[PDB]
Design a protein around this ligand. Structure first.
Ligand SMILES: C[C@H](CCC(=O)NCCS(=O)(=O)O)[C@H]1CC[C@H]2[C@@H]3[C@H](O)C[C@@H]4C[C@H](O)CC[C@]4(C)[C@H]3CC[C@]12C
Ligand SMILES: C[C@H](CCC(=O)NCCS(=O)(=O)O)[C@H]1CC[C@H]2[C@@H]3[C@H](O)C[C@@H]4C[C@H](O)CC[C@]4(C)[C@H]3CC[C@]12C
Lengths: 309, 312
């Protein structure tokens, strides 16, 4: 039978960046097409886009620095090949948009590049430094098997050594930072066409809007309070993958219940492609008690009318 | 409610004691230290223990507020931080826990990023932000998370703000040299040097001749220096999360599990999954387990403590 995990909002993590879920969120007057590639899983357990199971793999990279690269842009820049997260070489011919875990939004992603040398008191040398990956840059070509990152450090990155990127937040969200959580990177480089994408999601029913699991993302500096909205938390991805339960219809009716009072706070539609919609006519957070969680009710047809929240 | 494990390969598992993928299974029979880690602790019927919590983002993380810069005879720039619970609520030191859930459970110089987003906004009515590399020495007398405050240090000498919401994102270790005090089995003194740790998850050990603990091992990054340090957890975070969800009653003290190659259909070895949440194997060898990448543990039966494991 179909189930959802029993996890409160404070027990869920974002599927699009390594962050706890802070709040549920709606934005009906959203202009952009929602087509994120991480946190994408059908209700019958099929992963899509760049989605993989590891919380540690979201917006992470594994590979090897090849060389420093000279550029007209400020900073120190480095090219690294990218493998799959499990160390195997990335096959650019696989039907995926990019290596699984690749960031799915435009921005200056801030984190830590770390290296542990292959050569060896028979111990290998190590180094780690703050770094930024500009996913909108023409040098961001993960589908081709390589990317560029930049550092404040000017010299202390080694060529030919195993390299890991741990994401932490964003470098900036100012006017020149290109942050847009709904603009996909061009995974094959500048002016290229993405392929093998998880489909876009939209509410079709009148008065319905997408319901998001929202996390606020740290900044290296500057002003802003940026957020990342995912369609389903990573634990739901992991759960749906394990269960692979037959979808008895295209829409699951779920209720967001308060365990203290037993009362249903609101109901939503959980769609077969892995997203939620609610009947709500306003934008902003959902101010719900901390212990609330979604409970599966039943399968319904597409023409079911949600009670307004 | 029957007991189950998730079907996940090692490349689909993450460490429960530091935010890292599982790299290899691992034994160290000649281990002399007492094994009593506090993260990644869960009974087979789903009771979280120690400082264990469910969020992979909460492991070795902190939330709170920098109170002030402080002095220290050691070089660097030093900051005092109050710590709350990870969800932002104030930590209640009377709660029957060793420390705020997610607190690191080992001695070392934990390397990460401290980030801040100010409470006050600036009329486009947006708050200011900063982030810097930081190190938390869990062995320091100033590491008192059970008392609701800790100390971290930065290379950065100035750009850390007092009284503002502060987050610590762990990345790895600063050093594992001789003066770095790295020992994954030595607990922090959660309340300081004159106080006993309380509400601990119990120590684990094989109670059977020829058996040793089996760990899920992750290699942990280093800011610099030499070494190949690793963190061994008793069960991956996904097992903690699964056991908690299922809450299946334990029908004996030992669940027999087999590690299975789903391609060759073969059992590579068997292990005891103990009620307190750890594995043992009959292995005289130390070091990694060479097992195919598609393998995973399968629950086979409830047995007792006298079951003799097939040697691996
Ligand atoms: C190379 C990157 C932009 C590339 C680019 O093509 N920009 C223009 C966009 S477009 O091609 O016109 O689409 C820039 C964007 C943000 C930059 C970083 C951030 O500004 C933060 C850092 C600032 C320091 O002065 C230098 C290092 C530091 C870490 C920078 C390195 C270079 C980065 C990573
Ligand atoms: C204050 C910390 C040790 C506290 C301490 O009690 N040490 C002695 C051991 S005990 O008191 O006997 O337990 C030390 C340990 C490691 C140090 C850090 C690391 O060495 C890395 C950094 C090195 C830079 O030169 C300064 C900043 C930098 C980030 C250091 C700041 C101070 C730290 C964090």
């Amino acid at each position: 039978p179909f189930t959802l995990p029993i996890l409160t909002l404070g027990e869920l993590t974002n599927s699009r960046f390594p962050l706890p879920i802070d709040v549920l969120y709606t934005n009906p007057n959203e202009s952009a097409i929602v087509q994120c590639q991480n946190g994408r899983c059908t209700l019958d357990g099929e992963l899509q886009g760049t989605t993989q199971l590891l919380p540690t793999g979201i917006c992470a990279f594994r590979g090897k620095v090849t060389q420093q690269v000279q550029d007209e842009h400020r900073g120190t820049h480095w090219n690294m090949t990218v493998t799959n997260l499990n160390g195997t070489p990335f096959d650019p011919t696989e039907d995926v948009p990019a290596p699984l875990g690749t960031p799915d939004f435009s921005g200056q992603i801030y984190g830590v590049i770390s290296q542990r040398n292959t050569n060896t008191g028979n111990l290998p040398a190590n180094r780690a430094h703050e770094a930024v990956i500009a996913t909108y840059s023409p040098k961001f070509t993960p589908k081709l098997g390589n990317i560029q990152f930049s550092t404040w450090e000017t010299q202390d990155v080694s060529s030919g050594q195993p390299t890991k990127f741990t994401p932490v937040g964003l470098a900036s969200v100012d006017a020149n930072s290109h942050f847009d959580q709904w603009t996909l990177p061009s995974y094959s480089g500048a002016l290229t066409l993405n392929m093998n994408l998880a489909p876009s999601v939209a509410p079709v029913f009148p008065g319905e809007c997408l319901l998001f699991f929202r996390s606020f993302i740290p900044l290296k500096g500057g002003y802003g309070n940026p957020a990342i909205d995912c369609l389903m938390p990573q634990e739901w991805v992991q759960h749906l993958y394990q269960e692979s339960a037959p979808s008895l219809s295209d829409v699951a009716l779920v209720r967001y219940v308060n365990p203290e009072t037993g009362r249903t706070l609101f109901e939503a539609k959980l769609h077969r492609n892995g997203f939620l919609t609610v009947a709500r006519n306003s934008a902003g957070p959902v101010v719900a008690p901390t212990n609330g969680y979604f409970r599966f009710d039943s399968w319904v047809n597409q023409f079911y009318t949600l009670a307004p929240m």
